[PDB]
């Protein structure tokens, strides 16, 4: 789980940075979560007082959305939901979300 999450983070970082220009535009609903994590550095012609919208945009919306998408697509045991395997999987999913947030929260800093 954490291995696939870290590999997906590295591959999404290496693949989302193909173009050198992107900003707020139409169809940018992913940009509320991946405007700094799953997206490269933006253009350099705007006002200089904008370093707090990407420097402060941590991996809590994008990384939290990735953890919620993982917990909504993949799941745990439903008849054994008090056992330790589902608890270890939930701790692994929380650690994967926190690691993705710590790795992608500095998309402006």
């Amino acid at each position: 789980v954490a291995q696939i999450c870290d590999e997906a983070l590295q591959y999404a970082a290496r693949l989302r940075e193909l173009e050198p220009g992107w900003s707020a535009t139409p169809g940018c609903q992913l940009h509320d979560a991946e405007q700094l994590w799953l997206d490269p550095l933006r253009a350099q012609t705007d006002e200089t007082f904008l370093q707090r919208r990407l420097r402060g945009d941590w991996p809590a919306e994008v990384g939290n959305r990735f953890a919620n998408w993982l917990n909504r697509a993949v799941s745990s045991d439903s008849q054994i939901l008090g056992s330790p395997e589902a608890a270890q999987w939930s701790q692994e999913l929380s650690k994967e979300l926190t690691m993705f947030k710590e790795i992608l929260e500095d998309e402006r800093d």
């Binding site: 870290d6 983070l9 970082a13 290496r14 940075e17 790795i103 500095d106």
Partner: protein, 305 residues
């Protein structure tokens, strides 16, 4: 083995016509012994006018575009070749088969020596880049830099001075300078785990190198064996067989002031993690040990796990 004071860097070394044979029984990536040889050649053409030494080397392998083709819809892959000049009679040449690939890779160098405070950081990084730009790398050339302009700087840091969170800040600078790369370190740990779990039959390491890079299929207790990482069989040095001859004894040598030994090359096991798995970036270095009497030459990755 000396713990470095710096992590010098060369962020995108696009090479062309690299030697993707590397062994008599692998074919993918140029051997890490070639990379340690390149770092030692940089140390010999830089670290004599700077009073430093260079031993560590990182591998990230951003993209790997090979030069292969498959024949007639089969699931094997032949190599494509180069023609050769004609003989005296001018008929055709004895074409021998050698592979060829295209790469780029960054190098995380390690400056062990004391010449870090007698020179500023950008000066030593700039002249190491100016020397590394004119050197064949693994049987292939290094491409220079055009007017795309962005990774033209060559960073450096200082391991000796700083706090824990400041070293994490330098790590967050470096591992975002290397975002799409895939690291490479060799494992004796997993390979001895596979010895001591297959150990009932036979301790032969070749059958379990062959039985580890595999999509294995078994029956009921469809099923394919899984793994957290991406594994590779790489040559991990040399396993010299001959008694060491005196320099003038062996005919047709390279030079007659250093001795020769005849060698079959070893095989270990390597893997491919992202650089964001393992924390400290002194763990991604290829030191190489050597010993005179024991004919065992080896390209280890120490201090790792």
């Amino acid at each position: 083995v000396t713990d470095p004071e710096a992590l010098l860097l060369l962020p995108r070394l696009s090479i062309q016509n690299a030697n993707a044979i590397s062994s008599p029984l692998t074919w993918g990536f140029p051997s890490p012994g070639a990379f340690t040889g390149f770092v030692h050649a940089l140390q010999r053409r830089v670290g004599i006018s700077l009073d430093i030494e260079l031993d560590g080397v990182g591998i990230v392998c951003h993209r790997f575009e090979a030069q292969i083709s498959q024949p007639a819809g089969k699931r094997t892959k032949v190599f494509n070749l180069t023609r050769n000049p004609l003989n005296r009679d001018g008929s055709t040449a004895a074409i021998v088969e050698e592979g060829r690939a295209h790469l780029e890779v960054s190098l995380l160098l390690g400056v062990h020596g004391d010449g870090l405070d007698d020179h500023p950081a950008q000066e030593i990084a700039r002249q190491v880049q100016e020397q590394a730009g004119a050197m064949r790398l693994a049987g292939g050339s290094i491409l220079p830099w055009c007017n795309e302009r962005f990774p033209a700087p060559n960073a450096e840091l200082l391991m000796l001075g700083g706090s824990d969170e400041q070293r994490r800040k330098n790590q967050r600078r470096l591992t975002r300078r290397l975002l799409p790369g895939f690291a490479l370190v060799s494992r004796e740990a997993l390979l001895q785990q596979h010895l001591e779990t297959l150990r009932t039959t036979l301790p032969e390491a070749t059958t379990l190198d062959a039985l580890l890079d595999l999509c294995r299929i078994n029956f009921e207790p469809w099923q394919v064996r899984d793994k957290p990482g991406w594994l590779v069989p790489i040559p991990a040095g040399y396993n010299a067989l001959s008694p060491l001859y005196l320099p003038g004894e062996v005919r047709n040598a390279r030079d007659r002031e250093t001795p020769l030994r005849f060698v079959e090359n070893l095989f270990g096991l390597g893997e491919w993690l992202s650089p964001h798995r393992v924390a400290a970036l002194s763990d991604l270095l290829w030191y190489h040990h050597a010993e005179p009497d024991k004919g065992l030459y080896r390209w280890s990755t120490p201090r790792f796990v």
